[PDB]
Amino acid sequence: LMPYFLLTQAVRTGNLAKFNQVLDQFGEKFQADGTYTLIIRLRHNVIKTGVRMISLSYSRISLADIAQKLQLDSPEDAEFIVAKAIRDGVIEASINHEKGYVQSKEMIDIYSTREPQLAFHQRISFCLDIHNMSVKAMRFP
Amino acid sequence: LLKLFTTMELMRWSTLVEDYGMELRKGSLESPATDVFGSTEEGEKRWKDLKNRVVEHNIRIMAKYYTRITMKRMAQLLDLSVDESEAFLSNLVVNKTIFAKVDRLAGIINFQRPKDPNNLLNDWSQKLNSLMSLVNKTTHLIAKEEMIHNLQ
Amino acid sequence: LREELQLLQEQGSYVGEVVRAMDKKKVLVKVHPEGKFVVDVDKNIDINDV
Amino acid sequence: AVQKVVVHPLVLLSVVDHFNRIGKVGNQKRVVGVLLGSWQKKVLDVSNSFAVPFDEDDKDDSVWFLDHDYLENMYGMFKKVNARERIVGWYHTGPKLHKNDIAINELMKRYCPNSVLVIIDVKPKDLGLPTEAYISVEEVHDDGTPTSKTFEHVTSEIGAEEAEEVGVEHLLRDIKDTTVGTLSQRITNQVHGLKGLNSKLLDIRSYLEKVATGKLPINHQIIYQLQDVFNLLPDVSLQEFVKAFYLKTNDQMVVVYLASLIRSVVALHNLINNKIANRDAEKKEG
Amino acid sequence: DKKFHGILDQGEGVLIIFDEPPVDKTYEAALETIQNMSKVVDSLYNKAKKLT
Amino acid sequence: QAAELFLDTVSTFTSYELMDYKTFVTYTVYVSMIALERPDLREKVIKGAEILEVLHSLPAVRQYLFSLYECRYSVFFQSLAVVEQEMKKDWLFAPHYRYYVREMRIHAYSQLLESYRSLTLGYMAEAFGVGVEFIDQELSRFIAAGRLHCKIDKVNEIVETNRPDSKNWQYQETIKKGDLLLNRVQKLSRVINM
Amino acid sequence: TRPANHRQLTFEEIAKSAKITVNEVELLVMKALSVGLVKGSIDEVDKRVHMTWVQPRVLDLQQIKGMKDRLEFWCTDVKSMEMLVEHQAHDILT
Amino acid sequence: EFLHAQEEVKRIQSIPLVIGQFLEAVDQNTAIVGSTTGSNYYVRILSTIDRELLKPNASVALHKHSNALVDVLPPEADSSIMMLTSDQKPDVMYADIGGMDIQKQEVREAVELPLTHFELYKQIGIDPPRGVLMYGPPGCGKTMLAKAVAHHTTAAFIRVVGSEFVQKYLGEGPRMVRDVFRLAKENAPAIIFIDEIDAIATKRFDAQTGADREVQRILLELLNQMDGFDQNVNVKVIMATNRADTLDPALLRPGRLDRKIEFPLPDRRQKRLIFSTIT
Amino acid sequence: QIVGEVLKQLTEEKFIVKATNGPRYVVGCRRQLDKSKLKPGTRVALDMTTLTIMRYLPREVDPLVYN
Amino acid sequence: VIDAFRLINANMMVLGHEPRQTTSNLGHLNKPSIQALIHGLNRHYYSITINYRKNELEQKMLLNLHKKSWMEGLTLQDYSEHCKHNESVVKEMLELAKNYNKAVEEEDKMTPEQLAIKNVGKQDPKRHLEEHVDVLMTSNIVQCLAAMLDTVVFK
């Protein structure tokens, strides 16, 4: 996990050469585990992950600023990346071809308080399967 | 008195000084009237007292009628400018006579207390029960009138 | 428990300080409101059980 | 003149039994007697009943007879045994009311100034109504309407007599008309509440349809005055739900966290205790 | 020091004063119940009885 | 925990154990500064008469403590750097990158931007030291870290905070704990039936 | 006619209804509140008047079809939702 | 059906209760209670209520006609009034008193136990005092020390009032002593202050006249409660008397109450000090 | 009605009323009356049989000597 | 209590006593009170069996009409007292939290039933059982469903 720790640090930072070097050093175990194709996929999706994190960080971030932050050096590439993030739906960052506007959040609506209970009311389903298991497993003799 | 006591009329003192202001110039005896407003210094002081008095009266009657009223209309109704109208509004609120909240940058006012959801749903349920009682009473009334009308 | 409540409607039991255990299944007892109440013996407890 | 009347669960069955016992030979379908009780705080209550044999003829509804001496002796005995009891009204069966009611009221009001009429449905149990109350008002039908009889229904609600709970519980002891079994009982409550709402509102819709057809006389002068407000009362605006999006949804989600989860956790504790016990028993039996 | 109920919107050069509803302490009380009714029990009990 | 059991000003010796009573007090001040920001801390530590006396004994210590209490960032940041330098010269330097100055300024920035909605970066920079770019990068780094509940409008250079209501934030806390305890009960469902 | 179906009594709607000017709207709605026609809130940013009536009158019994239709709409909605919750509740009620 | 039956049998009425004090839970499904009119009888204890509020000698609730254990009333001070929580209230703080000391050093000694120091009572090996009788006249107030101290170190303060206690509620006297002792035990910062002992409560030289045996039995139960305290907690008990001569030896003997303090007359120098302080 | 004193109000529903001659009971209050009219330590009237508060009454003391 | 008996002459006791005749019906649920036993009545001849004329046309009338709740199941009552009721519920279940805590650290390794019998506490797992939590949940869901049913009726 120490090289995995450095991989996490590289994912957060957005740099390339350092983690490429450490992969060339100790990537054979990654190949043995069978994730090296995925390893390169992370190596080139580090920019996507950094874009998600910086979009969560900022409200209206400049495309030039995000390109400089994640080593894109290209306004058009930054625009393409934010387009790809929004079409993937991982983040809510939108595009305004004027300067790169992104909408902010809003106060809580009808379902924003109800989605936790809707996604969590399986508690009674767990209770009923527990009770049925008890019914199955209360043999007296 | 009949005009200026009740029914929340627009007490535009500019109109009143001629509609009901004849006591200043000539009435039946006009002697108490000339003592009050016909005087020069104390008379003008009591004139200003009528002016503000009717300003707060208009503010109060507007409180129970209009929730949000635009600043220009409120100032025109109070026969003053925006700053004077807001100053008198502050003078009322510091006395707690009216429940008023104003956005000064937007210059828009509100007189209704924010309804807590507890009592909001409570009055909703009271409305529901009023409707239920109305259903019961209407049902009995129409059924019995139906009986009387098919007694043929 | 409801039947116990109905029994307690008749006070349930009465506290008695036993003094004299006579041979003929008899105990004088003392009850705080009044005092001595000569009475028989129960079936679960013999004369000597007193 | 009374604001409202409240009927006890004390005289209904007595009236029904009186009907049953005096209808053995009198098949007029018309049981007429007096309901005695008390009126104290604009709330009238009935504590005792009495039936008198009574024969009618359809000819102008003026053929009848009673035993007034016996009825008055009954009232004197009832007042002697219980002074607070007084004749609160007179009752007739046969909810299809005839025209002798005015004469009966005129004759009996010497016992009660605000004479009222009570109809008991011995055989009918339509939805839940045991009886209906009637107040006599002949002071002009309306501002711009001709003369009429116009016996109106003073609002009636079934009261709660004391010390009858023991008897009714012992009597039924089979249905348990209480909130027992809370969840299922409230489900049944919702069910028959919806049933009653649908039936009554369907009756109101039928009354509106029949008024539109005009086959029956139209008492619009109170009908629209009472139903227009009902219809226009704004219980359809949903922006108050917008303002109260967490109307209780916070309580809903805390209950999901703290009742369903708590039940699941306690059931899990019971199951794992039982599993430990069963495993230990299976391992240490021999 | 929570002596006032507002937020200073410097961009608009104003301060938005808001009437804070304090009846929402049920939220925090429920969280405290969750914490002191689950943490103190689940970990301890099902780490003591790891084998079942 | 350290603070809760360490404010007790009952020393076994007048000057021993932790090298002094003054060093004891410096430990107390550091621990409290890590501990909280500014609630009735006035009535918890500031009211301490021995506390005020020992801050009289140590002016610079009194200086940064009163700077944090008064929320005057211009002197606060310099004094906080001095505090970090002092902690470097101390073997109790375990929070070398977490809780020397970053956590304290996380608390300070929370305190500042709360009761604010949109405070400009350029003016908050001079109200909080100098180097508008330095404050901008610090805010970006700390928002990435997770605290400082706000966002940055870079095209206009504004700090638009997002403070949840009492209901909203506590709701968020409850859903987080619901996630943790669903994980717990799923682990316990694994424990059962095996 | 509109049971809060159109609860936005804007100035233009008021002008269509009463062929009255803008300044007279204030006095007209004041007298309406005084008599008992409309008792709702009166705004001026949007000039919206909330709709509550507590002084009913003749509803043109030849036009009782509208209220009959609204009442039967309420009946259909209530019965449909009762049947829907019965469908959801067969697992207990059946 | 069985869930319906279970939720149906859970009615237990319990609206029209009456009060008759519990003696003690001998076992489960058996008990002994004493009603308000006496009539101590053995009863059956239902499983609805148990040890959670079934403290030994606290006043409880009973059914109107069944006298059965239904509920236990938590509060104890207002059962017979006799003062209550004079705590959380500065009436006269401490140094504001005009009597300066008289001694007041034995009284700071008496507050040492409320002023924690129960841990320092051990280790050092000292045995802190328990009973403080002040056999002084109304000079010094004799209650400016108990209205104070109770606020100097936050602690509950009770007037008790001996004259009121001797009354028809002599059978309930033991019970009220138990209740007030329980109120004190509930709050380790508490001090009992009893007044007007000398003339009415257990005079030892004039023979028993009628209800004097009731007073002696009440004092016996007070001794029983103070012995059952046995330094279990840090609450304190102080009587205030004008003359301790008529007092019973049982309270007067060491091992129950030790510290005798006399609060003398204004002491002309101290009197001038009092005048300055009040004025 | 029997005469007693409000020994303890307990709560809004149940109250402690002590008869002048011994027993105190946990009773209800009269519907028309309110707690502000009942108050603690005030003379009241309990129902003879059902044992519930029926009316509250003022009291008086008299020295009746050399008046 | 409605107990009916008969007074007897002196001859019934000198003949074969217990005038209760030869059948196995009046021995069903025949529990005379102690005072009745010590008195002659309810002991002279027998105790009479009671029965209630629960005839239909009468009993159906009573059950249908007297105990009447027919459109009263439509009450909404979302938060009339229920916000503070939920506050109190949270406080009660926090007490339950402390109780179930106490139980889980009691949890002794000596057949915990042995510990529990002598250290009953009437806690959430023992006496404040899941039934009370179910009552709270039923109240909440009943108010929820009434509110939501009327919300969908509101069209």
Ligand SMILES: Nc1ncnc2c1ncn2[C@@H]1O[C@H](COP(=O)(O)OP(=O)(O)O)[C@@H](O)[C@H]1O
């Ligand atoms: N500063 C003070 N110093 C001494 N006594 C005071 C002071 N202030 C008030 N007092 C008096 O002390 C009195 C207490 O008297 P009291 O309690 O009746 O005496 P005893 O306790 O002997 O019965 C009060 O009546 C009050 O007037």
